[PDB]
Structure formats: C-alpha cells, structure tokens
Structure 1
Amino acid sequence: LQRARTILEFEKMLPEWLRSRFRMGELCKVADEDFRLCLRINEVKWTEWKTHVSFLNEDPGPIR
C-alpha cells in the first residue's frame, strides 16, 4: 500500500502524451459492437475438471 501511493503520484506528473504510450490493456471484441479494453491473466487449475464452453476464441495459442 505504501508503494502503490508512490506509483500513482508519479502518474499524475508525467504529461498526456506519455500516458498514451504506457497505457495498459488491449481492445477485445467481446460481443456484437462491444469493445472494453481488457487485461489478460493466465491460470493453471488441476482440480475442477469440465468440458469447455463460453470461450471467445476456438484456437488456444497466442495469435501475434
């Protein structure tokens, strides 16, 4: 919590054209006409086994 207050006070200082270059996230077509600028986290799970539906992408590998 003490380091997080140091990170944010650096961010109000640097100008507007620097905040576009160091911006987090990527635009993702969630549904028909819906783009939300999400953030990706990976996960490995060995306990709950199930068949997979409700995925956005059929091909699993990183595309570019």
Structure 2
Amino acid sequence: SVLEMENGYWWCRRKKHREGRLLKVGPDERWCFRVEEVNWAAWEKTLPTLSEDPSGP
C-alpha cells in the first residue's frame, strides 16, 4: 500500500522523496538511514563509530 501510494495517482504523479540522509562513511558518501537501539548487554568501547557526539533526527 505504501509502494502504490508513493507513485501518487494516475492524473498527477507524486514527487519521489528520498529516504535517509546523504552522509559520509570513511569519501564513501552514501544515503543512509538511522535506527536507534538500546542494548543493555554490550558495554564495549572497542568499536569505531562515525561521529563522536550524539545527535537528534
């Protein structure tokens, strides 16, 4: 239903909105999509992240 509503109607055609944001991965710039998960069992800072500061959507 959302894949048929994204096209819009037959008379007028809807604009194609891009999902996510064009971010830079280490320049390997990709269109990405953030999820946010709460894991109470990792506790490991031995993992490289893209950014250093948290940020809202």
* Aligned-pair CA distance for 1:51: 1.9
TM-score scaled by length of structure 1: 0.63
Question: What fraction of aligned residue pairs are identical, expressed as a percent?
Answer: 37
Q: Which has the higher strand share?
A: 2
TM-score scaled by length of structure 2: 0.69
Q: Which has the higher helix share?
A: 1
**2:44 matched residue in structure 1:** 50
Q: CA RMSD in A?
A: 2.3
Aligned residues: 54
5+ residue gaps, structure 1: 1-5
- What secondary structure does 1:29 align onto? strand
